[PDB]
Amino acid sequence: RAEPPHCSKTPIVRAQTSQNAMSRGMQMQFSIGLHTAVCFRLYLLHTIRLEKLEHHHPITQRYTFGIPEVHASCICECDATSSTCTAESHQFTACPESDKSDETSSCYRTFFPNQTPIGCSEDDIPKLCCDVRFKPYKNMTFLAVKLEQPTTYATFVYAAYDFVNGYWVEKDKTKIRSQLDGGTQDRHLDQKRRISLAVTAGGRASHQLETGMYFSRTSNGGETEELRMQPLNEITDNNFDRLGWYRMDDSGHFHVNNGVVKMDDIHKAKVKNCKEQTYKSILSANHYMPGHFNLTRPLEVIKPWIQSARIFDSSLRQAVVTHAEGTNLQISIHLESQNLVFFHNASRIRDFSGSIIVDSKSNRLFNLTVYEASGKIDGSVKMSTGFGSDTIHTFTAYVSDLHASNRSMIIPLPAIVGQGARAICLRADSMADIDKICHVIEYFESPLFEDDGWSHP
Amino acid sequence: RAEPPHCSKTPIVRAQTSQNAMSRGMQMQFSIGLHTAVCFRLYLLHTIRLEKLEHHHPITQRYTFGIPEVHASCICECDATSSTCTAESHQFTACPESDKSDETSSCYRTFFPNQTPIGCSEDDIPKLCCDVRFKPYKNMTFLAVKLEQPTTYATFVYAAYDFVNGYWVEKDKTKIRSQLDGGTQDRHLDQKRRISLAVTAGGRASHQLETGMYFSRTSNGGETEELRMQPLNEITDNNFDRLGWYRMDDSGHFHVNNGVVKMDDIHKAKVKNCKEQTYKSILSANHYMPGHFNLTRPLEVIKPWIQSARIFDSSLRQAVVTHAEGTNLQISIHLESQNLVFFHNASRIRDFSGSIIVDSKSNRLFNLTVYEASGKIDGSVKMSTGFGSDTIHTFTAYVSDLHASNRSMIIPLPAIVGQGARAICLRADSMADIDKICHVIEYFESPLFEDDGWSHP
Amino acid sequence: RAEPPHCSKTPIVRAQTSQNAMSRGMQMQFSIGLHTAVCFRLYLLHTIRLEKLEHHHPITQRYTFGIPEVHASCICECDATSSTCTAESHQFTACPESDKSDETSSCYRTFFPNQTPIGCSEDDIPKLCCDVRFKPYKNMTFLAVKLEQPTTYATFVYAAYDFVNGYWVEKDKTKIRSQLDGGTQDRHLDQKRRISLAVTAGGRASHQLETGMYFSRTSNGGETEELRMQPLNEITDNNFDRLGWYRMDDSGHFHVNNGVVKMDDIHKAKVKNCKEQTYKSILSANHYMPGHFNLTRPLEVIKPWIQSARIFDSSLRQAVVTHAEGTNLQISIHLESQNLVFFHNASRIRDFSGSIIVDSKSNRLFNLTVYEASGKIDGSVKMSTGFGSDTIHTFTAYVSDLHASNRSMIIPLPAIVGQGARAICLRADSMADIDKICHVIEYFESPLFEDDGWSHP
Numbered sequence A, B, C: 001r002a003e004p005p006h007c008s009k010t011p012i013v014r015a016q017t018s019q020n021a022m023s024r025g026m027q028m029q030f031s032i033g034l035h036t037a038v039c040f041r042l043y044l045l046h047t048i049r050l051e052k053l054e055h056h057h058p059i060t061q062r063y064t065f066g067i068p069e070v071h072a073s074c075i076c077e078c079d080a081t082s083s084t085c086t087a088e089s090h091q092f093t094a095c096p097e098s099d100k101s102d103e104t105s106s107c108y109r110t111f112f113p114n115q116t117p118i119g120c121s122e123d124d125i126p127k128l129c130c131d132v133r134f135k136p137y138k139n140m141t142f143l144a145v146k147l148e149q150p151t152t153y154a155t156f157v158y159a160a161y162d163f164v165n166g167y168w169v170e171k172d173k174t175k176i177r178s179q180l181d182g183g184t185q186d187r188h189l190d191q192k193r194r195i196s197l198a199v200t201a202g203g204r205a206s207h208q209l210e211t212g213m214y215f216s217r218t219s220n221g222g223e224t225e226e227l228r229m230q231p232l233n234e235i236t237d238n239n240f241d242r243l244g245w246y247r248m249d250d251s252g253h254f255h256v257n258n259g260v261v262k263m264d265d266i267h268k269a270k271v272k273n274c275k276e277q278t279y280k281s282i283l284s285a286n287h288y289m290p291g292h293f294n295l296t297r298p299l300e301v302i303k304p305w306i307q308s309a310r311i312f313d314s315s316l317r318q319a320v321v322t323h324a325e326g327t328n329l330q331i332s333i334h335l336e337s338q339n340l341v342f343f344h345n346a347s348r349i350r351d352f353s354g355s356i357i358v359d360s361k362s363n364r365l366f367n368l369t370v371y372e373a374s375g376k377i378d379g380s381v382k383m384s385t386g387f388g389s390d391t392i393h394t395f396t397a398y399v400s401d402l403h404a405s406n407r408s409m410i411i412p413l414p415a416i417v418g419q420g421a422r423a424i425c426l427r428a429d430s431m432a433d434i435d436k437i438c439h440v441i442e443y444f445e446s447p448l449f450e451d452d453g454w455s456h457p
Ligand SMILES: *[C@@H]1O[C@H](CO)[C@@H](O[C@@H]2O[C@H](CO)[C@@H](O)[C@H](O)[C@H]2NC(C)=O)[C@H](O)[C@H]1NC(C)=O
Pocket: A007, A041, A045, A163, A343, A344, A345, A346, A402, A403, B019, B020, B021
């Protein structure tokens, strides 16, 4: 049932190997695009597909955090000399064992002297004492990870096909992994060890996830899911305006990172009426419940170049970022006297549909859907709705399926492709200019979505 | 009046296209440098110039800020039990409507009990109450933007020239835009749709503006100008040591981001004499007036690789960074039996002038000015003032004008080209070594320029 | 005594130069790997070695810091109206000249009223006054530097060898420096100015040190050593959780950056017993002594791609980062009718040894040591301990020595090469598959090493 991939139209360069003071060897060179295949015969169809481009980021930091659910409760004393409510009992201290404590809860104390005698005698200088309690919100736990500069790997699929009877028969299928950060990587590619595959990257990948703090939900069983990015603290940092200040210890117990010491800086309270036991209370912090947390969607949902961004396995040592968009790699195929012949299939497209989108994260793109398409498809973006209007941008899209297929794809657009409807014309490689499919594509701009008082008694 | 560009000396690689099970096609391959042109005839002179290399960064955050002009005014009460000056009236509160308010001003209160009875009786425990007022300084408004990982575009200029009579005649002129982050981008380049242009980048651009917070002045009419970089807060951050804590709301009203809550942390005051109504007051913050703000020059002025860095248009969705310095792109020109012949013009230079500069931002460079020059010019930096001294560095500069022209350019230098005068010799491509112009170039090192108490009653 | 380097097996591409309207020139093109050499004869053996790949980062910020040794001493007054211990004497003030001061020490005051009358009468409201002293710990001084976006330089070694009698004789040896960030860099390479060397990078280097704050120890004589990275403040930042808040002025005197103003925010104290003069005291800060500092090892020790990362010289303007791992560069050698012939030497390996390591910083690698090896060595990593088990990864290693030599090297591994022992098979370029050396390599995973209360009277 196995069929070959679309054999891409590629220019080949004849390279001649250097000579040694013994016994010349010819090599075939070409650039291979990400998600494309190259086919050749040897004088059994051999196919090389660039399946994956990945960044393997070492995880240099790890801590477990949650979203705190905060409740503060205060008591006022009208008389500043009262034995009740003191810096001894409420300043730089956790709530006592005697103070009604839930197992999952963490409780820190605050002390506010120099209150106004509302509810007291004119000469009283009240003091307000508080318990600030933190609970894990909806038992939502997250793993915080520092991702550093990655190593780059390309995964190729080598498949060999024989055309026995009237159907294609898959004879060989192997996955070839090659490191991209250094020099040329070489290996044998066929079962007979006759054909060799050399891979060479020209510099860094066009994209990379920036060194920094990322995180994912931790679940029952398969702990980690897709990584996300939201302002988050490094292990040694304790900025209450960022995620991660509500940390989990060796046991599954959450605490406010340096809570006892920091509480007086974050919790701010003032009396309303001392007698009536009423007050104003706030938490000069971010990412807590109620009303101070909104979880960002994963990286792969919000960033078009990211196909996937996940922690590799349960050892939590590497984060693997799989690329949706990436530049070509340089390939060199070397091997009695034999002939290596490269083959490609024709490109087709029946029709297309789409919309020009400017998403809530400012990504300018053409959401393209092709119909009964395969191969290299050249697109041209026009100045207006008229098909004959000036070309403002040109691009090429590549369809993977050997048979004509219906597929969706994101084409990034330059800032010149501004507001309003315009024509986009698509033509398959080596088809008359008359054989182009033009359409008026509608424009959809989502407004920029971005983030950013006192509670009673 | 239109004349062609200098046709660059380029090596060409014969590539042969793969074959399909129908009906071989030859391609011409070469590397094109940024700001260079390549010329060819078809068997009407066709020219391809790599005009621009650009990064289109999506703008993921936006807020408007200004520079606050701060004035604090305090009143002291000798008696701690006085109805005047309390935590009710001055702690965690904006100044009242009754408290003399300018429309453009924002006013926050501070409360300082436990003062020393200087100006009172020995047993008094004074309290100091303050109004901390903020005004926009010189009505200077700025837009803060978060720039994320860009998409890359090359702009080429294709021009066709006929030599009718005794003058060059420009027959065709189009701008070709090509995306660099993915695979090979292809399009038709001539009016007759006979010639095709494939563009391929080998990885990321040698330069990129780092993901982060940038900003520009906002003006009357054409809102935004050149982008700048200075320590600046992300929308969800509120670090008083960085720009952006003085924000503008829906109306043109500026406020201290979380002012009511944060004032007691930033404003610090102490009595001098309670009776005399004198005090010490400071703002533990940065980027305010008087004496705490110094505006950084734009990115393109301070960073030699940046030609321009601007917000694209009034929709404020993309920032366009135009590159002054960038690596070459791989080009492949494909098409009865016709012959494609590449042509170049000779390189010349009459003389040169310059100085070796180490600017206030530590950029080590040769400020080069060429005279009656055109094309490829090879430079060599020497160990001493002697022309015959050891070569310590070699470089190539490219002059765009078809006719010999006078032009200025920045050549970056490695750390080996340290202090003191030295010889620099310049030779145009394919000129005798005798035909080199040597000069003793003077060295100019600017010291590193970098940034970083109590006011009375 | 000088011997040539191992001449690498390289494929050559015939390029033809464009033509001018005067009097064609053939060029030889190939990719050169970092730490490899290419040899050719001219119709005296000419060798080109890519010796170094370097980033020259401009230093945009500089300040000198140390590690503070903190001691706090407090005195309590039972009576809040006492002339002794006031906001005048202890709030927002350095310790007086009269207050026993060491020349190297810096002393800041804190004031804590509203204490509990432990050791006093029931109606007393004690006040606690402190001196917080800072000393340089072990006179350890560091230089903090901001490293910005670098310029890239390749250093080549051109050597010419004659084989006179029975020994190799080194006739010429020069170091060629070439900038990588822009277009093709060209120069003459032989003494006779007959051979030219053009160098072209395809994009940015596969690695780069991220723009940010770095630092090194400052010593007697040769001031700076290897750079390090640990959370560190920018010159305008003053985050007490990061390094650099303990700064050195024009003279060799250390101070707490904005100490007078910030002390009340960082130093937190509470009375134990007023009469007994006992208290609790802490410093809500990081990177101080005792017990709050642990120095990170240099970048080159912890990051496998970094060979060296140092400040260039005493002017402190550039940081040079030398790369251990980097992608290939494109080379083009151009020149009566003469013939250019490229030569390579055979590849050999007697045996190998190693271990698969996952270090304390999450780097996954094969610590490879080769025996009597030279040239291109192809490696294959297996699924299990069995030599015939499925290949999970393939790589190529390059040995520099012309003679068979014993050398250690780090091969990075993809996340697929998880826990447990497995076979690794090594084969030299153009040796039978039978001529491979397989070994069962043991796995060593170091746990992730990462960083992150009250003192008595
Ligand atoms: C795609 O390309 C291949 C190679 O050009 C096509 O041809 C098959 O393979 C060899 C030629 O290399 C022939 O001997 C076979 O007879 C071909 N198979 C068939 C089914 O004709 C292949 O057919 C192409 N596939 C499509 C879908 O067009």
